[PDB]
Amino acid sequence: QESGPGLVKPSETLSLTCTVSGFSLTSYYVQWIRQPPGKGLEWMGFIRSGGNTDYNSEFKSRLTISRDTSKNQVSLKLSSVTAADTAVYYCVRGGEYNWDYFEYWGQGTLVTVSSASTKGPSVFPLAPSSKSTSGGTAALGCLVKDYFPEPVTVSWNSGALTSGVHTFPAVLQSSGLYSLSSVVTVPSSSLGTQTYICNVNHKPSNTKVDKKVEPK
C-alpha cells in the first residue's frame, strides 16, 4: 500500500502496508512517521526484531504495527480516524549497512480522511502560441482540474522531458476539488517536430491521463 495514496472515511481504520527487504539486516526496524499538510514530523511507533513494538502514547489507543515474515511486509493500522490523521505516512526502514547507520524513508503515502468520494482529473492543454513565446523559447503545459483527493504526479514524455518542468502546488477550489498546472519551456523550433505529452497520475482514483499538447 506504500506510494498508493487515497481516502479513508472518518471513524474507519487506516491500514497501510510497506514491503521491506531487510528483516535479515542487523539493527533492523521499521518506524512509522507522519507529516500532516504544511506541518512537521510526528513519530508514531516502531516494530523491531521478533515483532517487538513500541508506540507513541498519543496513538497507543488506536495504533497497531505488525509484520508478516511470509510476505516481507510491515503494516500500520490506525482505528477511529479523523481529519487530524490526514497526513503523509512514511515507512522508515533503518539499520546498519557498510560502516553506517541508515534510514530509507520510502516515497510516502498521503492518506486523506474524508467522507467525500474520489474523483479523477479533467486534463486540459495550456497550448503554445505567439503569447507563450520569449526569444526562441515557448511555454506549454497541462491544467489538471477537479480531482479529489490529493495527490497528482505529472511527468512529461514519460520522464524523457525533465528540464524546464515546473509543477505547481495544488489549490483547493470553492468546489472542494483540487487543481494544478504543470508547465515546461521548450525551443519554439521543436513545436512542429517534437510531440509533447503530459502524463498525469491520480492513484487515489486509479486513473492515469495522458494529454498531447499541440501548438496553436
Binding site: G40, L41, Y90, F102, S130, V183
Partner: protein, 218 residues
C-alpha cells in the same frame, strides 16, 4: 517528552557561504557517552533524508560540506559551502527518549541575483469551455525574488476575487521561483468579453509587463 527548538526559523545564504542551524533540547540527549541527535533534510516535494546521526556521524552519500557538532542540550548543523541544491527544510531529531521527537524545522533559502520573470498567457481550451468553465492561466517563469504582483484585466476592467496564485519552491539549479495565476470564469462571462490581459509587477522589471490575447484569435 523532550522538546527540540531550532534557530533560526528561516535563513537566506549565498552559494559558497556558510549556513549555521542550531537545535536546543529541553533535556539532555546524552546516554552511554552518546549524543542521540540526528539531522534531516527535506527538499521540496521529497521525503526527509538522514544527513547526520549521533550528533556528528555523516550518513552514506552525504557530502562532507555537512557537519554536526554539540553535546547534551545544544547542537549545530553547519553547511560549510552552500550549494543551490541545499534549498530545503532542515530538522533536528532526538532518539534519547521515547517517543523520538523532531524540531519544528529551519527553512534554508538560497540568495541569488534579481531575475525578472518571463511572462506567458494561455487562453482556455475549447474543450473546457464546453463544460461551462473557463480557466485563463498566466505564467511568471524563473524569477527572484519571490515577491511579484499579478493583476488580471478583462476589457480593461481590473479583476478581484476570481483568481488564485500558486508558487513553486526555489529551483534546485538556478534558485528561481515560478508562479501561476489562474482566472476562473463561467463560460458566459468569458464569452461576454474580448481582451484578456495579465499585468506583472516585479523588482527585476523597470515597468510592468502585460501579456494579452483577444478571445477568438490564437
Amino acid at each position: 517528552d523532550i522538546v527540540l527548538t531550532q534557530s533560526p526559523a528561516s535563513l537566506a545564504v549565498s552559494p559558497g557561504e556558510r549556513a549555521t542551524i542550531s537545535c536546543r533540547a529541553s533535556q539532555s540527549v546524552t546516554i552511554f557517552s552518546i549524543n542521540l541527535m540526528q539531522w534531516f533534510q527535506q527538499k521540496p516535494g521529497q521525503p526527509p533524508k538522514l544527513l547526520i546521526y549521533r550528533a556528528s556521524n555523516l550518513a552514506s552519500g552525504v557530502p562532507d560540506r555537512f557537519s554536526g557538532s554539540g553535546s547534551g542540550t545544544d547542537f549545530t548543523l553547519t553547511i560549510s559551502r552552500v550549494e543551490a541544491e541545499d534549498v530545503a527544510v532542515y530538522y533536528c531529531q532526538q532518539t534519547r527518549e521515547s517517543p523520538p521527537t523532531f524540531g519544528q524545522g529551519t527553512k534554508l533559502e538560497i540568495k541569488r541575483t534579481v531575475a525578472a520573470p518571463s511572462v506567458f498567457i494561455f487562453p482556455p481550451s475549447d474543450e473546457q469551455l464546453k463544460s461551462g468553465t473557463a480557466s485563463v492561466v498566466c505564467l511568471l517563469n524563473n524569477f527572484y525574488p519571490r515577491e511579484a504582483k499579478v493583476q488580471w484585466k478583462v476589457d480593461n476592467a481590473l479583476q478581484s476575487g476570481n483568481s488564485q496564485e500558486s508558487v513553486t519552491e526555489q529551483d534546485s539549479k538556478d534558485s528561481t521561483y515560478s508562479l501561476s495565476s489562474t482566472l476562473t470564469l463561467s463560460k458566459a462571462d468569458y464569452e461576454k468579453h474580448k481582451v484578456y490581459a495579465c499585468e506583472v509587477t516585479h523588482q527585476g522589471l523597470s515597468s510592468p509587463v502585460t501579456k494579452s490575447f483577444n478571445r477568438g484569435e490564437c
